Swiss-Prot record, chain A:
Name used for this protein in its record: Ceramide transfer protein
Origin: domain of life: Eukaryota
Segments forming domain PH: 1-94
Function: Shelters ceramides and diacylglycerol lipids inside its START domain and mediates the intracellular trafficking of ceramides and diacylglycerol lipids in a non-vesicular manner.
Gene name as annotated: CERT1
Pathology linked to this chain's protein: Neurodevelopmental disorder with hypotonia, speech delay, and dysmorphic facies: An autosomal dominant disorder characterized by mild to profound developmental delay with hypotonia, delayed motor skills, impaired intellectual development, poor or absent speech, and behavioral abnormalities. Some patients are non-verbal and non-ambulatory. Additional features may include early feeding difficulties, poor overall growth, seizures, brain imaging abnormalities, and dysmorphic facial features.
Assembly, per entry: Interacts with VAPA and VAPB. Interaction with VAPB is less efficient than with VAPA. Interacts (via FFAT motif) with MOSPD2 (via MSP domain).
Organism encoding this protein: Homo sapiens (Human)
Residues shown, of full length: 24 to 120 of 624
Post-translational modification: Inactivated by hyperphosphorylation of serine residues by CSNK1G2/CK1 that triggers dissociation from the Golgi complex, thus down-regulating ER-to-Golgi transport of ceramide and sphingomyelin synthesis.
Tissue-specific expression: Widely expressed.
From Swiss-Prot, chain B:
Domain spans labelled START: 8-228
Disease implication from the record: Neurodevelopmental disorder with hypotonia, speech delay, and dysmorphic facies: An autosomal dominant disorder characterized by mild to profound developmental delay with hypotonia, delayed motor skills, impaired intellectual development, poor or absent speech, and behavioral abnormalities. Some patients are non-verbal and non-ambulatory. Additional features may include early feeding difficulties, poor overall growth, seizures, brain imaging abnormalities, and dysmorphic facial features.
Upper lineage: Eukaryota, Metazoa, Chordata, Craniata, Vertebrata
Organism for this UniProt entry: Homo sapiens (Human)
Protein name stated in the entry: Ceramide transfer protein
Domain of life: Eukaryota
Protein's gene: CERT1
Impact noted for substituting residue 82 to A: Reduces ceramide transfer
Summary of subunit composition and partner proteins: Interacts with VAPA and VAPB. Interaction with VAPB is less efficient than with VAPA. Interacts (via FFAT motif) with MOSPD2 (via MSP domain).
Length: 97, 234
């Protein structure tokens, strides 16, 4: 149960939200600049074993993925698209555990 | 370009490589845990002498790693939060971010008084990518200097101290500018002190279990108060 697609990711205090290519596979999330640069090293990844996926109450597009102090901030394009990503990550995590 | 540059590079590199590692786990002993502050202690013996490496972690809201390291390094504000130093002065200015300090510590009766001679350097570790956070570091390690030779009034201690700070930023509400409610400073503090004398361990360890928590709580709280209402310095 893998998935990939564009998502808006909070990067750093200069750039903030930027569109990035996210991939759910191998009990982890990995993100790249775009789909074209998948075969060019990952820019960042996070294991889902002990991860918590929290949707934002006021930002209906935003959902956060935290493994201890390490946190990813992601925005889909609407609440419908967010829920699909949230459910995929939970199903993938459970089927991997 | 001063004569300690290579030495500084090695010390910073070693701290960036081996001090940021989360808890030799069980080799480190948690002695104090208060909120986000955790103080770990290890009891090592090498070269005919027993030492006690200190390592602590802390998360401080509303301040950046740059701000924390600035206040930790700036001698001009030391008297506002430090409570164990009796006197000190700058022996030599090596560069805008590197100085040699001589200081005497108030005597922890009945142990002999300690002084220390160390190079203090503050440096930024640039982030290699957008995912890696910007790290600031202050390293204080002992050096020799003819202006501060050994005396018979104090016991010369040897130190290797580092405070490594990283700033975690969370997305602000909507499209607003970052505020201090969105920033968190991850502090790693390590201290390897060689007292240089023959004081009993029970007194040395109890004093360390007492003064390190007090200094971290007071120092971080001080940085919070001085930065309140001020524009963020990333």
């Amino acid at each position: 149960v893998e998935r990939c697609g564009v998502l808006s990711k909070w990067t750093n205090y200069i750039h903030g939200w930027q569109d990035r290519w996210v991939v759910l596979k191998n009990n982890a999330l990995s993100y790249y600049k775009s789909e074209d640069e998948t075969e060019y090293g990952c820019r960042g990844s996070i294991c889902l074993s002990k991860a918590v996926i929290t949707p934002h109450d006021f930002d209906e597009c935003r959902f956060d993925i935290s493994v201890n102090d390490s946190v990813w901030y992601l925005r889909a394009q609407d609440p419908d698209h967010r829920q699909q990503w949230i459910d995929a990550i939970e199903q993938h995590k459970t089927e991997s555990g | 370009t001063h004569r300690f540059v290579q030495k500084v590079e090695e010390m910073v590199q070693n701290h960036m490589t081996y001090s940021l590692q989360d808890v030799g786990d069980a080799n480190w002993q948690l002695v104090v845990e208060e909120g986000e502050m955790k103080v770990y202690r290890r009891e090592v013996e090498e070269n005919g002498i027993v030492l006690d490496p200190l390592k602590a972690t802390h998360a401080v809201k509303g301040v950046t790693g740059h701000e924390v390291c600035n206040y930790f390094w700036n001698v001009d504000v030391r008297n506002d939060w430090e409570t164990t130093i009796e006197n000190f002065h700058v022996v030599e200015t090596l560069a805008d971010n590197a100085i040699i300090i001589y200081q005497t510590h108030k005597r922890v009766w009945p142990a002999s008084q300690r002084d220390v001679l160390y190079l203090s350097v503050i440096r930024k570790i640039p982030a290699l990518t957008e995912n890696d956070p910007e790290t600031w570091i202050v390293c204080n390690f002992s050096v020799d200097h003819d202006s501060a030779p050994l005396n018979n009034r104090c016991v010369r201690a040897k130190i290797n101290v580092a405070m490594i700070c990283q700033t975690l930023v969370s997305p602000p509400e909507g499209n607003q500018e970052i505020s201090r409610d969105n920033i968190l400073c991850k502090i790693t503090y390590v201290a390897n002190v060689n007292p240089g004398g023959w004081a009993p361990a029970s007194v040395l360890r109890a004093v360390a279990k007492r003064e390190y928590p007090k200094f971290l709580k007071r120092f971080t709280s001080y940085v919070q108060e001085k930065t309140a209402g001020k524009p963020i310095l990333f």
